[PDB]
Amino acid sequence: AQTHALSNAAVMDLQSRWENMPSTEQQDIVSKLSERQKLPWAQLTEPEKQAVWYISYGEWGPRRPVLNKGDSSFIAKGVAAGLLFSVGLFAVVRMAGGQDAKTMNKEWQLKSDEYLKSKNANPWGGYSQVQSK
Amino acid sequence: VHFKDGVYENIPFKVKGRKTPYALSHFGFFAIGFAVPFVACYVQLKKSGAF
Amino acid sequence: ANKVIQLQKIFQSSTKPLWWRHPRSALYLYPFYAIFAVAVVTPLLYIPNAIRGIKAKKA
Amino acid sequence: DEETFEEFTARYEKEFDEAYDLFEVQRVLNNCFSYDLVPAPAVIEKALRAARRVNDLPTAIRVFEALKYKVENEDQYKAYLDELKDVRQELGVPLKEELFPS
Amino acid sequence: GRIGESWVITEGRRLIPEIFQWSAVLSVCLGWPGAVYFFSKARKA
Amino acid sequence: MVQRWLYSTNAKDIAVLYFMLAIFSGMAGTAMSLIIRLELAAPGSQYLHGNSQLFNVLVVGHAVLMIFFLVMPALIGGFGNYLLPLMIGATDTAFPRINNIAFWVLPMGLVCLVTSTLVESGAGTGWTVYPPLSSIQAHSGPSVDLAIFALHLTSISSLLGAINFIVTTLNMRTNGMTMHKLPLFVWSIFITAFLLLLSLPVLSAGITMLLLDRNFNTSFFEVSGGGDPILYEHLFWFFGHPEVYILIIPGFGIISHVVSTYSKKPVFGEISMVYAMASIGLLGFLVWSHHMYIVGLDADTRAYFTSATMIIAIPTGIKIFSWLATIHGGSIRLATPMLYAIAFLFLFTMGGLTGVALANASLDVAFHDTYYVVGHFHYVLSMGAIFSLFAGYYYWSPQILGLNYNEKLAQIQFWLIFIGANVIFFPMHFLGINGMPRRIPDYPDAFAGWNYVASIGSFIATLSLFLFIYILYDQLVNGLNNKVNNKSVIYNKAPDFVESNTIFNLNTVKSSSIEFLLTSPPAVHSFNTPAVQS
Numbered sequence: 046a047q048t049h050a051l052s053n054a055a056v057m058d059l060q061s062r063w064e065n066m067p068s069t070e071q072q073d074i075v076s077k078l079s080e081r082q083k084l085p086w087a088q089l090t091e092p093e094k095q096a097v098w099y100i101s102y103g104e105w106g107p108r109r110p111v112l113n114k115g116d117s118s119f120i121a122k123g124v125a126a127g128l129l130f131s132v133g134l135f136a137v138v139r140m141a142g143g144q145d146a147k148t149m150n151k152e153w154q155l156k157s158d159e160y161l162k163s164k165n166a167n168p169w170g171g172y173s174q175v176q177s178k
Numbered sequence: 179v180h181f182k183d184g185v186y187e188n189i190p191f192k193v194k195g196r197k198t199p200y201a202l203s204h205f206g207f208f209a210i211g212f213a214v215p216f217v218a219c220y221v222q223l224k225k226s227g228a229f
Numbered sequence: 230a231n232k233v234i235q236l237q238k239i240f241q242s243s244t245k246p247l248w249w250r251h252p253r254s255a256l257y258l259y260p261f262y263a264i265f266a267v268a269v270v271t272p273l274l275y276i277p278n279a280i281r282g283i284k285a286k287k288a
Numbered sequence: 289d290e291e292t293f294e295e296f297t298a299r300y301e302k303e304f305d306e307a308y309d310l311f312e313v314q315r316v317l318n319n320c321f322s323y324d325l326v327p328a329p330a331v332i333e334k335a336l337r338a339a340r341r342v343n344d345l346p347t348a349i350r351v352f353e354a355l356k357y358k359v360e361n362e363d364q365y366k367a368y369l370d371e372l373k374d375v376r377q378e379l380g381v382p383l384k385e386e387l388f389p390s
Numbered sequence: 391g392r393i394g395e396s397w398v399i400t401e402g403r404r405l406i407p408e409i410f411q412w413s414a415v416l417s418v419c420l421g422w423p424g425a426v427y428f429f430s431k432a433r434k435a
Numbered sequence: 436m437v438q439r440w441l442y443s444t445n446a447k448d449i450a451v452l453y454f455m456l457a458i459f460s461g462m463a464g465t466a467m468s469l470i471i472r473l474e475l476a477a478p479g480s481q482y483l484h485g486n487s488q489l490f491n492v493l494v495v496g497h498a499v500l501m502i503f504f505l506v507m508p509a510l511i512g513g514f515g516n517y518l519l520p521l522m523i524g525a526t527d528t529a530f531p532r533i534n535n536i537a538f539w540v541l542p543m544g545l546v547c548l549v550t551s552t553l554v555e556s557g558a559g560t561g562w563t564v565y566p567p568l569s570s571i572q573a574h575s576g577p578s579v580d581l582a583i584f585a586l587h588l589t590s591i592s593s594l595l596g597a598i599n600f601i602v603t604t605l606n607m608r609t610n611g612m613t614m615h616k617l618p619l620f621v622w623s624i625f626i627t628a629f630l631l632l633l634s635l636p637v638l639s640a641g642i643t644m645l646l647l648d649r650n651f652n653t654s655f656f657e658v659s660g661g662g663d664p665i666l667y668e669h670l671f672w673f674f675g676h677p678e679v680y681i682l683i684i685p686g687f688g689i690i691s692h693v694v695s696t697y698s699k700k701p702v703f704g705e706i707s708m709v710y711a712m713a714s715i716g717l718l719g720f721l722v723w724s725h726h727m728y729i730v731g732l733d734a735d736t737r738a739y740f741t742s743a744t745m746i747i748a749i750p751t752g753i754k755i756f757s758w759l760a761t762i763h764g765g766s767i768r769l770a771t772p773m774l775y776a777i778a779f780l781f782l783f784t785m786g787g788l789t790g791v792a793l794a795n796a797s798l799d800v801a802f803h804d805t806y807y808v809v810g811h812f813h814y815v816l817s818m819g820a821i822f823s824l825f826a827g828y829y830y831w832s833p834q835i836l837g838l839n840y841n842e843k844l845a846q847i848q849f850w851l852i853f854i855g856a857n858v859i860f861f862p863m864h865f866l867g868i869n870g871m872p873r874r875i876p877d878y879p880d881a882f883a884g885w886n887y888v889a890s891i892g893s894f895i896a897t898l899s900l901f902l903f904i905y906i907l908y909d910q911l912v913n914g915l916n917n918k919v920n921n922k923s924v925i926y927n928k929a930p931d932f933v934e935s936n937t938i939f940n941l942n943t944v945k946s947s948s949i950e951f952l953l954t955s956p957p958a959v960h961s962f963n964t965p966a967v968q969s
């Protein structure tokens with residue numbers, strides 16, 4: 046096998062540099078580290094060890110997560126912006142609706158309660174009709 | 179019968195290589211669907227004399 | 230008489246669609262297509278009156 | 289499936305000795321950690337000696353990482369690191385915390 | 391014997407925080423109409 | 436081009452036409468429910484100028500479009516025709532020309548229902564079309580005829596398709612696959628095909644007899660000739676209930692696949708899932724008169740139907756606990772299809788528990804024509820069957836189309852419909868328990884409160900549908916780019932814990948059904964040498 050170690054310029058910070066490396070240069074690093082793992086493992090250097098762990102189980106390629114960092118916050122902002130737009134659109138279409146019914150006032154609703162209190166309406170759960178201005 | 183294979187070949191509508199933008203077909207198709215209840219209302223409110 | 234084998238070789242060596250291979254198929258397909266067009270167009274030409282409430286004066 | 293714990297170790301010990309490439313050592317290891325039990329120390333030792341024979345260091349590191357997920361306490365993780373002391377030292381296997389210290 | 395702390399302490403430490411997070415979610419899913427009535431004219435005048 | 440899409444004999448091409456028509460119809464049925472909810476916002480005439488016939492017309496159009504022109508051509512006409520032949524190894528369907536006529540009758544049934552609302556005054560009858568309100572005395576002119584012919588054309592469609600589904604499953608399985616080895620989604624289309632075959636012919640008797648009273652001087656239901664209106668309800672509801680199960684079971688089979696994929700576990704007790712689906716399909720023929728509890732039936736008739744209706748809760752609850760058992764102890768991956776499936780388990784349980792109260796005949800006296808009923812069946816049909824339809828599209832469309840969708844845009848879409856659907860239908864139970872009748876355009880003033888809240892949620896949910904229409908546009912124009920940037924999910928299963936990144940590239944797919952092993956857009960000649968299993 047290839048015995049000489051890989052140089053520090055080659056595998057210094059493999060995790061940070063891996064994503065931008067050209068593909069043919071990625072294959073060459075893998076080939077040399079495969080011959081190096083055939084030696085006793087107590088000889089290998091730390092940058093060499095961190096490279097072999099990262100290439101197998103690093104959070105890249107297949108192991109890319111469902112949401113990237115900053116995506117949940119985009120989602121919460123998009124939901125709150127969708128609630129605001131629909132509610133403000135409802136209030137514009139309401140402005141083209143028909144006039145209020147003649148009975149939807151507090152003055153009319155307080156004479157309704159006058160009639161119901163005499164007839165003893167809802168004697169344990171309330172009869173009041175007041176819901177307007 | 180022999181047909182072609184690929185990405186945009188198993189659908190009846192054209193998406194690429196067309197003169198007019200595909201947005202006019204995509205949203206025009208779903209606009210006409212959303213608009214048939216309002217055509218019905220117009221005919222019937224024009225029969226009751228409301229208009 | 231028996232004509233299964235003879236029609237069997239006409240059909241299997243023909244390029245035309247299935248409903249066109251028999252030599253007698255022109256006499257059915259030409260008049261059917263004309264009749265099929267009248268039977269589809271004419272009911273459609275009456276929906277304008279139905280929406281407008283005009284009834285035919287068969288009287 | 290009625291397999292006692294003693295039959296579990298004696299069957300996966302046999303299964304780690306027959307693995308002949310990396311695909312086989314990773315596939316057997318995946319199934320061994322997928323039951324409702326932590327494999328015995330004598331099973332972990334045979335999984336380390338199987339990754340040495342196919343010459344793969346990251347698979348031996350991941351063995352102890354799965355071990356710290358499967359135990360119930362952190363004092364069960366320690367007692368394993370105190371049984372497999374020589375083997376982790378004789379083959380030269382580091383711990384993932386020792387390799388990427390925080 | 392058993393190594394480490396009792397399984398009651400280990401499981402207690404994991405579920406108690408989740409009971410409170412469950413009751414704060416189901417209250418929102420079932421009690422959100424109570425807030426609409428809180429800001430209404432009909433309520434408490 | 437003309438003969439590929441007008442002369443088609445391929446089951447994949449026909450399934451694409453189904454989905455195109457199904458989604459064009461949900462536009463119209465959603466627009467009608469929006470007009471309905473605007474007129475219910477406040478007391479008084481609001482937008483329809485006091486035309487109560489028009490309000491009733493839009494309610495019939497709303498129900499017919501949602502049921503017979505959206506949910507059936509998509510769950511069955513679409514997913515059944517596309518995934519059932521691929522999941523069993525079939526090279527086509529049996530009867531490919533029958534498969535094509537069962538689609539082309541639905542466009543002709545739409546130009547019958549639409550022209551029904553434009554002629555005279557339309558059909559303001561309800562989707563059940565009870566006589567004598569729907570006879571020529573109380574509904575003159577050709578509107579109710581044109582609506583019956585529309586229903587006839589959807590029955591020809593569903594019956595012909597069911598005969599094709601049954602023969603294909605029994606006759607065209609691949610080497611080694613026995614009936615105990617079928618995928619659970621194949622079982623759900625097979626059982627549904629039998630309910631359609633035994634219930635549709637009873638509905639065609641009822642509504643053809645209604646057509647005869649109107650135009651041929653007949654007294655099946657006319658009271659002056661001896662007929663009986665209560666006969667029509669027996670004949671209509673003997674098809675009705677089986678229909679609601681014809682609408683949920685295909686969604687039961689979709690939920691099974693999605694939950695198993697995003698747990699990395701097989702379905703718990705897979706054999707008892709088929710037995711439960713068969714028991715629910717059988718008990719759905721013995722319960723129909725829970726829809727007639729107050730029309731004057733005998734007290735011993737009503738006590739039978741109470742106990743018959745309740746015991747369908749036992750097999751359904753087995754499927755609920757079974758689904759919770761497969762996700763327990765899993766490795767859950769929260770992609771968009773998994774979000775809908777978890778919401779289905781919570782919102783279907785709620786809708787089904789309000790049905791258990793309705794099952795008792797004594798309590799249904801306070802629950803007849805009450806909004807409370809409307810609240811029950813929008814929880815199981817709109818947070819039920821509809822949520823399983825979204826789960827299916829996000830699960831299979833990247834494979835079917837070869838084009839990926841924007842993932843984070845799709846999670847915004849899910850939350851906007853989950854929030855908005857709950858706002859429409861949860862207060863419906865409050866209105867009903869206090870006594871608000873259904874099928875009214877106008878109400879007393881004490882019902883204004885909850886009716887305003889529900890009309891707001893109706894705008895939230897329509898906005899979520901418009902976001903889905905944009906997501907379709909983005910997938911069709913930018914689908915190839917969604918694979919190279921990080922805007923979409925590539926693998927629905929990730930590497931196992933000890934499996935390295937490069938070993939994972941040897942077998943990217945770990946699937947227990949064939950469909951994820953094909954080319955991304957599957958080939959038009961998918962099998963030449965038959966697939967083989969042990």
Ligand code: HEA
Pocket residue numbers: 458460461462465468471472494495497498501502506509561562563809813816817821824825828856859873874875893896897900
């Ligand atoms: C399929 C069944 C279905 C669906 C989905 C809906 C959806 C909705 N329904 Fe309706 N409804 C019925 C079936 C359905 N309904 C029936 C049978 C009746 C009774 C008729 C009768 O009384 O005669 C009824 C009655 C009814 C009434 C009673 C009116 C009255 O009594 O006169 C009201 C009132 O508001 C109402 C409202 C709504 C609303 C607001 C929605 C909306 O919330 C919809 C919310 C969600 C969506 C916007 C739909 C999704 C959009 C799609 C196009 C899906 C596309 C998906 C893919 C292709 C992947 N419905």
Ligand code: HEA
Pocket residue numbers: 679680682683725726744745747748749751752753755783784786787788790791793794795799802803804808811812815816819820
């Ligand atoms: C998808 C459609 C669908 C589904 C699945 C159902 C399911 C059920 N329905 Fe529903 N129903 C409709 C659609 C549907 N319904 C429609 C459209 C109407 C109105 C028609 C019209 O008038 O236009 C209607 C109306 C209707 C009526 C008539 C009421 C009336 O008109 O006055 C009744 C009567 O009993 C009923 C009951 C039930 C019951 C018991 C179930 C059961 O299957 C539910 C069982 C499910 C569960 C129970 C949940 C999970 C169970 C467990 C977790 C087990 C543990 C539980 C216990 C021990 C209780 N519903």
Ligand SMILES: CCCCCCCCCCCCCCCC(=O)OC[C@H](COP(=O)([O-])OCC[N+](C)(C)C)OC(=O)CCCCCCCCCCCCCCC
Pocket residue numbers: 128130132133134135136137139140141142143144145
């Ligand atoms: C964190 C917990 C959750 C957080 C909770 C978040 C959700 C909270 C929801 C609370 C908001 C609810 C408000 C309800 C809407 C409303 O009240 O509208 C008020 C009125 C119309 O209301 P109305 O009473 O029905 O009108 C009567 C009909 N007449 C008689 C007029 C014909 O409207 C009017 O006529 C006057 C207002 C005119 C509109 C301008 C207002 C701003 C809209 C701008 C438009 C922007 C978008 C449209 C783009 C085209």
Ligand SMILES: CCCCCCCCCCCCCCCC(=O)OC[C@H](COP(=O)(O)OCCN)OC(=O)CCCCCCCCCCCCCCC
Pocket residue numbers: 112113114115116117118120121124412415416418419769774777778781850854
């Ligand atoms: C439920 C009560 C309120 C509902 C209505 C309001 C909804 C909130 C508005 C939208 C929230 C946006 C949050 C951003 C996404 C996020 O949170 O993502 C955070 C996590 C993971 O992402 P991460 O943080 O690890 O990485 C972030 C990288 N950028 O995803 C989740 O956990 C999703 C939770 C899935 C829930 C399934 C569907 C829930 C409905 C079922 C009913 C629940 C049971 C009820 C009984 C208890």
Ligand SMILES: CCCCCCCCCCCCCCCC(=O)OC[C@H](COP(=O)(O)OCCN)OC(=O)CCCCCCCCCCCCCCC
Pocket residue numbers: 189190191192193196197198202203204207450451454455513514517832835836907
């Ligand atoms: C109006 C434009 C005319 C332009 C004038 C021509 C000048 C040259 C311009 C070139 C364009 C040629 C125009 C030809 C027509 C055309 O390509 O798009 C026009 C087509 C119409 O035609 P149609 O064949 O689909 O039939 C239908 C006619 N009723 O719109 C559309 O369907 C848009 C439909 C998109 C929505 C469908 C989304 C579904 C996605 C598939 C997912 C399936 C999932 C399956 C799961 C089971």
Ligand SMILES: CCCCCCCCCCCCCCCC(=O)OC[C@H](COP(=O)(O)OCCN)OC(=O)CCCCCCCCCCCCCCC
Pocket residue numbers: 176417418419421422423424425426427428429430431432853854857858887888891892
């Ligand atoms: C699972 C899904 C949950 C989603 C949560 C719902 C939030 C989405 C938006 C809901 C729309 C609000 C309708 C308002 C209609 C209206 O106009 O209200 C009118 C009332 C006054 O009444 P009035 O008679 O004067 O009206 C006069 C008519 N012209 O003003 C209000 O009360 C303001 C709204 C209060 C805000 C509460 C919103 C709910 C949030 C719940 C938070 C958790 C609560 C937990 C309690 C235990």
Ligand SMILES: CCCCCCCCCCCCCCCC(=O)OC[C@H](COP(=O)(O)OCCN)OC(=O)CCCCCCCCCCCCCCC
Pocket residue numbers: 529530531532533534591594
């Ligand atoms: C309003 C008045 C009522 C009218 C009834 C509706 C009319 C629609 C159909 C018109 C008939 C055209 C012939 C098509 C049938 C055919 O050709 O069946 C022949 C098919 C051809 O098989 P293949 O070509 O697909 O495969 C290619 C193999 N060579 O053999 C089969 O499938 C075998 C099973 C036969 C079942 C046929 C069922 C009969 C269809 C009518 C069902 C109507 C049900 C509703 C009853 C009211």
Ligand SMILES: [Ca+2]
Pocket residue numbers: 474475476477478479480481876877878
């Ligand atoms: Ca009104």
Ligand SMILES: [Cu+2]
Pocket residue numbers: 675676679723725726
């Ligand atoms: Cu029912």
